[PDB]
């Protein structure tokens, strides 16, 4: 097993569990944050066929399951299913006892504090961790950059952040939160695939559409001329073989899916877009911070592996920011993992080991200790 | 006798009783599901000459009997004659007391529930079985395959099934039932034998025509070129010596009989055929099931011992299914018995012994207990 007391870094954003140990390059366990459950009856007698499938096994059996994400927009909705996800995380995937390891959880800013508080209650009461710490996810995404100055966009499966930090000091009044992320892009892609002719409605078919979004989507630097480019010829069409047979061929849907991220009116969501929430987070900072946020604009979570989103990102923030400013969009190709990687850095720091919310301090101050020790 | 409480596996599809014990290779008793009855008067005084002949004895005396099948399209029509068939099954052929043995009956999906209910009432009230269980026949046909994933076609004497199962879970919305089977093929062969010149009209002559169908029929992989092949030369003609004398010589009737199974318009039956009800049962399943149904397409009851029906079957399902799918038609030569063999597996399972509908639970809940314990 693990012969030491190495800290656990568990990172469930809203749609993908990535967990592992501190002082480590990559997360050891990366699996979908789903719990599946059979929706019709078992007939082969003597089969096993447990009435819950968590993680990657659920996508192995998703044709006979109703898949259900226990965490939506960064908020944990099903608590017993999230306990299934954590139980599978420690005991099956990462294959370790939580009693021996301090654990580092992550969440978004501007979240309900009962998420953080009940997450601490489940970590100490159910899994009996010795220490525990919730961490703001974009902050850790700046720990992976090796920077102490920068504004961080990450955009996981349920939430996007823009946390600005200058010289180690965060600017929590200048913080942002938009609930437009990759599951919303998956749903919008599923809608416009219904526009082309392909009907995906099941949760398993939603997982297929999510795969189409990951394999086969880019961001379109200039959306109008890319739109007319797809309207002119079929040079942007691309085929995807569905599981078990039929192939599909998608055109302008390839880049209309993450244009919703730059233009949230497509999914009917009144917002300013990703590029304007970055600029508005920078303009909420003080005057002497802003060029150090322009040159350090870290873009480091999931849903940013769309090809060209750093080009669209710089190309649009440059149009908002004044001239003679140096707009550098940092898009480090190890992102989708850098919230975990910065979790690994922070949990492996030696200054940090008196910042763990420990037990006998949880037992002393109840579950509200998180609002005086964590942030 | 039997020194234990071994379960009985009785399997009357619609035209052939095959019964025996659980934990057993082959059924111990295989005999025709007929009850014969004399249609003219007895003249030799001091003869015996009982006024009912059940099973194989009826085919020994079919020249002076009117043979009558008590079970038609998988539905039991004569109940007193089916009680003759069961009485002969337990007490004469299998030669055992039903009071000592739990019994496993089989029927088709999508059957009248009074068949299942009255079959349970006759098993407990008349034969006094300690336990009883009806079982879906194609499901058991997948128990004999050693598989828990596959779509099952069986096609007994009165009914054909296509039950799809994935990872132990059946898909009862994707289930099928066509009432085109081997007795209908026997009647159609009897009609086109009347077209050639040979008149078979009696029930005993119907049994002769059924023998001609079993000995002397194949399925014709390409029906049009086989049809013109028989029209070109006499290399497909084959002779059959009838009982007591005259020989016959059949040509294109050798393969026009089971082409009705692939093309039900010949018997005037509006349907899609065997090959399209398999593909339609697969397309009614979810998207992530289908290649595991394509590679596991079990073809395992009676009326499938036509030579080449797995070749016609794969050759036609491949034309319906998309390319880059692996169509495997499983045709295990122990079929015509594999519904019984999977009955033997299921009744010999140790998980199954609390799934028997037992007496004192029949007496508690009436005969409708079958619709909460069986399926």
């Amino acid at each position: 097993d693990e012969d030491e007391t190495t800290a656990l870094v568990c990172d469930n954003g809203s749609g993908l569990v990535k967990a592992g140990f501190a002082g480590d390059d990559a997360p050891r366990a990366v699996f979908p944050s789903i719990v599946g459950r059979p929706r019709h009856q078992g007939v082969m007698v003597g089969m096993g066929q447990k009435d819950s499938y968590v993680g990657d096994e659920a996508q192995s059996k998703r044709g006979i399951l109703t898949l259900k994400y226990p965490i939506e927009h960064g908020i944990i909705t099903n608590w017993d299913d999230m306990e299934k996800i954590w139980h599978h995380t420690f005991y099956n995937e990462l294959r370790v006892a939580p009693e021996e390891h301090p654990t580092l959880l992550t969440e978004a800013p501007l979240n309900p504090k009962a998420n953080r508080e009940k997450m601490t209650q489940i970590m100490f009461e159910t899994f009996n961790v010795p220490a525990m710490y919730v961490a703001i996810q974009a902050v850790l995404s700046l720990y992976a950059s090796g920077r102490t100055t920068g504004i961080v966009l990450d955009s996981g499966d349920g939430v996007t952040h823009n946390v600005p930090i200058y010289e180690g000091y965060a600017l929590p009044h200048a913080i942002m939160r938009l609930d437009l992320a990759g599951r919303d892009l998956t749903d919008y892609l599923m809608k416009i695939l219904t526009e082309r002719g392909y009907s995906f409605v099941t949760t398993a078919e939603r997982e297929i559409v999510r795969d189409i979004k990951e394999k086969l989507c880019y961001v379109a630097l200039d959306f109008e001329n890319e739109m007319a480019t797809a309207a002119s010829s079929s040079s942007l069409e691309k085929s995807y073989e569905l599981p078990d047979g039929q192939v599909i061929t998608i055109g302008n849907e390839r880049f209309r899916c993450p244009e919703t991220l730059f233009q949230p009116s497509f999914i009917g969501m009144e917002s300013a877009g990703i590029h304007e929430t970055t600029y508005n987070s920078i303009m909420k900072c003080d005057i002497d911070i802003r060029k150090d946020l322009y040159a350090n604009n870290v873009m480091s979570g999931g849903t940013t592996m769309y090809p060209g989103i750093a080009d669209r990102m710089q190309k649009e923030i440059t149009a908002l920011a004044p001239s003679t400013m140096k707009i550098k969009i940092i898009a480090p190709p190890e992102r989708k993992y850098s919230v975990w990687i910065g979790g690994s850095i922070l949990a492996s720091l030696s200054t940090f080991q008196q910042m763990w919310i420990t037990k006998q301090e949880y037992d002393e101050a109840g579950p509200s200790i998180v609002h005086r020790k964590c942030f | 006798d039997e020194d234990e409480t071994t379960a009985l596996v009785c399997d009357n599809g619609s035209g052939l009783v095959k019964a025996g014990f659980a934990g057993d290779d082959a059924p111990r008793a295989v005999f025709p599901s007929i009850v014969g009855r004399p249609r003219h008067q007895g003249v030799m005084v001091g003869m015996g000459q009982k006024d009912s002949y059940v099973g194989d004895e009826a085919q020994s005396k079919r020249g002076i009997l009117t043979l009558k099948y008590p079970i038609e399209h998988g539905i039991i029509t004569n109940w007193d004659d089916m009680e003759k068939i069961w009485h002969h099954t337990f007490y004469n052929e299998l030669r055992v007391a039903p009071e000592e043995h739990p019994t496993l009956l089989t029927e088709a999906p999508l059957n009248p529930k009074a068949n299942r209910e009255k079959m349970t009432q006759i098993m407990f009230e008349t034969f006094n079985v300690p336990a009883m269980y009806v079982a879906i026949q194609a499901v058991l046909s997948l128990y004999a395959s050693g598989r828990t994933t596959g779509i099952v076609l069986d096609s007994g004497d009165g009914v054909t099934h296509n039950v799809p199962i994935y990872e132990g879970y059946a898909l009862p919305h994707a289930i099928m039932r066509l009432d085109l089977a081997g007795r209908d093929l026997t009647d159609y062969l009897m009609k086109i034998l009347t077209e050639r010149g040979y008149s078979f009209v009696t029930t005993a002559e119907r049994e002769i025509v059924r023998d001609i169908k079993e000995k002397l029929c194949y399925v014709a992989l390409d029906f049009e070129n086989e049809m013109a092949t028989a029209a070109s030369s006499s290399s497909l003609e084959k002779s059959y010596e009838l009982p007591d004398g005259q020989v016959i010589t059949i040509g294109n009737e050798r393969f026009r009989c089971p082409e009705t199974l692939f093309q039900p318009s010949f018997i005037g039956m509006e349907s899609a055929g065997i090959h399209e009800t398999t593909y339609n049962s697969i397309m009614k399943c979810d998207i992530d099931i289908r290649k595991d149904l394509y590679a596991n397409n079990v073809m395992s009851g009676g009326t499938t011992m036509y030579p080449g029906i797995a070749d016609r079957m794969q050759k036609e399902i491949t034309a319906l299914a998309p390319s880059t799918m692996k169509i495997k038609i499983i045709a295990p030569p122990e079929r015509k018995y594999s519904v019984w063999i999977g009955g033997s597996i299921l009744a010999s399972l140790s998980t199954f012994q609390q799934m028997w509908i037992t007496k004192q639970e029949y007496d508690e809940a009436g005969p409708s207990i079958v619709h909460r314990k069986c399926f």
Binding site: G197, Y198, S199, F200, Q246, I248 | -
Partner: peptide, 7 residues
């Protein structure tokens, strides 16, 4: 894809 009727 999908359906019947749908692609």
């Amino acid at each position: 894809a999908x359906x019947p009727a749908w692609x």
